């Protein structure tokens, strides 16, 4: 009978990393609706959203991760969560979405993919709908020497989203989980954006 699905629910039951903070913020303004999670991983954001009345397409290239989302989906009876194993470097999609999110994924994709992928996300977003992106940057103050095949330049994500309402946009310094030669978390700027299409 206990129907609450908070940021502890999947985290504690299935040992997932807690729901991304920007997803927890986003849902304060983005109403439940049709959702697309690009590079869903082990599902921390897709399961949280499906459990809270969003209809979610959860896509990733890691078959083991998608099997894990499927397994949890079955246990929890999340009939509004739909998984696929895909390659974002060779994918085009056509449905209309209320909300598309890609959190800490785009830096793993080929540089040639990004302009077309961003264009596809923007085209597949309903007017009034939202896109949430968090991704690594490469800047003079914080070079990306981590080996990501892609990283945003300073101002680049802003420019992609020039005609959108930027509910949140920043390029703040964050940390990777991985550590450097001295065991200190690697520091990089990340483009974080929550944007609403006009
Ligand atoms: N070419 C590709 N196509 C689809 N997914 C990819 C990809 N390259 C990396 N990924 C996925 O990107 C994810 C990065 S980890 C971040 C996962 C999730 N967005 C979260 O916030 O927890 C992994 O699940 C990885 O498999």
Describe this structure in words.
It is classed as transferase. The entry lists the keywords antibiotic resistance, transferase. The assembly is monomeric. With 198 residues, this protein is an alpha/beta fold. 25% of the residues lie in helices and 30% in strands. The protein has six helices and eight strands. Strands 1, 2, 3, 4, 5, 6, 7 and 8 form an eight-stranded mixed beta sheet that branches. It starts with 8 loop residues before the first helix and ends with a strand. The protein binds S-adenosyl-L-homocysteine (SAH). S-adenosyl-L-homocysteine is lined by residues 20, 39-41, 44-45, 60-62, 65, 86-89, 103-105, 108-109.
Topology:
Layout: H1 9-14, H2 21-26, E1 34-38, H3 44-51, E2 55-60, H4 63-76, E3 81-85, E4 97-103, H5 114-123, E5 125-136, H6 156-160, E6 165-170, E7 173-179, E8 185-196
Parallel strand pairs: 1-2, 1-4, 2-3, 4-5
Antiparallel strand pairs: 5-8, 6-8, 7-8
The protein binds S-adenosyl-L-homocysteine.
S-adenosyl-L-homocysteine binds at residues 20, 39-41, 44-45, 60-62, 65, 86-89, 103-105, 108-109.
